[PDB]
Amino acid sequence: SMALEQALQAARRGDLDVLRSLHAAGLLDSLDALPVHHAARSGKLHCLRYLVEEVALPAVSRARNGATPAHDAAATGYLSCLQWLLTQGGCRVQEKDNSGATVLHLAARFGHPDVVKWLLYQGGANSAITTDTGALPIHYAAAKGDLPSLKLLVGHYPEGVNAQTNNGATPLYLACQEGHLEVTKYLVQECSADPHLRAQDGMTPLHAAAQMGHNPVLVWLVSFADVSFSEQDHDGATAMHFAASRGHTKVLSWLLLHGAEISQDLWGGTPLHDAAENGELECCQILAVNGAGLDVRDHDGYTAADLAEFNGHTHCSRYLRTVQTLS
Amino acid sequence: GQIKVLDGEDQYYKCLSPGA
């Protein structure tokens, strides 16, 4: 398969000379992509144009996942190649891959405000379309942290502000989960994003920030966005449970310094149970120093030291058991 | 809880820039 590798590399490097060489020699992958895919991949408009017009290679070919070359150009953000594919090339802006993603999703997913701005206002792209997971282009820009793209998407399709993916995430949930504070302030201050809209499991954007350790987001939300750190998921788990359980000493300490209680969830487990069960020794210590009740039993009758013992976390058990026999 | 993702683990788009 000597021909394939040379065409794909020449197309990707911008090597018009090799392309016209292979072609004249009558020589024109594993994922079913083509040299048109590789040209579009890094914005070699000249090679891509020669690849379609002169050598008559179709530009509507779909890779294994249904990605045509225009999807490729949008993901990688090379606007000039995408324009040629949609206008002259023969690609249609509403084309979906096998997941439902159009070129405007990809443009948002990989943060290319110019590709997004062109697609919305000159390209005819529909910003109300969901992928099979239920994601709007606005969900991608928020998760990516692309505030310029998000701005365009809020103006073009403002009802997307509180839209939920199939698992219940809003754009705010995704921004908070991913730690994008500027996007988070913009959705709440300027677009009246609801911060109490929960995912399917009962988690709020506050929990997502606590779960992933994004203290800057968590602090802004709790202070300036009418979210309370006593917020609970469907199991009664607080921001402090999620921080402790995933080892986020920064979030945990901030919560504890500004007054959040150390409370049991619906199952009787405190954030110390969660830290011990996941073997987060430093969180166990921070919670113990902040006066967590070491002997509190959950619904199964287990203390935090018990859970640490059962899940093999011997330094957590050792510590908690010895701090208790100190008292 | 689990983290909320928008896509599957397919690598076709991520492995399009020279980032793989």
In the 3-class helix/strand/coil scheme, how is chain A assigned residue by residue?
A: CHHHHHHHHHHHHCCHHHHHHHHHCCCCCCCCCCHHHHHHHCCCHHHHHHHHHHCCCCCCCCCCCCCCHHHHHHHCCCHHHHHHHHHHHCCCCCCCCCCCCCHHHHHHHCCCHHHHHHHHHCCCCCCCCCCCCCCCHHHHHHHHCCHHHHHHHHHHCHHHHHCCCCCCCCHHHHHHHHCCHHHHHHHHHHCCCCCCCCCCCCCCHHHHHHHHCCHHHHHHHHHHCCCCCCCCCCCCCCHHHHHHHCCCHHHHHHHHHCCCCCCCCCCCCCHHHHHHHCCCHHHHHHHHHCCCCCCCCCCCCCCHHHHHHHCCCHHHHHHHHHHHHHC
Q: Give this entry's resolution in angstroms.
A: 2.3
Domain-embedded: residue A76: yes
Residues A256 and A322 in one domain: yes
Minimum-distance CB partner of A174 among B4, B7, B17: B4
Residues A17 and A112 in one domain: no
Cβ atoms of residues B6 and A143 within 8 Å: yes
Tokens of A302: 């287990």
User: Taking CB atoms and an 8 Å cutoff, what residues of chain A touch B2?
Assistant: 201
Residues A121 and A220 in one domain: yes
Domain-embedded: residue A98: no
User: Taking CB atoms and an 8 Å cutoff, what residues of chain B touch A166?
Assistant: none
Question: What was the structure determination method?
Answer: X-ray
Evaluate the CA torsion angle A103, A108, A112, A116 in order and state its sign: positive
Residues A188 and A160 in one domain: yes
Say if the Cβ atoms of B4 and A133 lie within 8 Å.
no
Which three-class secondary structure state does DSSP give residue B15? helix
Q: Which of A176, A197, A227 is the last residue of a domain?
A: A227
* Domain boundaries, position A155: 105-227
Residues A85 and A192 in one domain: no
Residues A64 and A27 in one domain: yes
Distance from CA of A75 to the nearest CA of B (A): 7
Minimum-distance CB partner of B16 among A41, A165, A199: A41
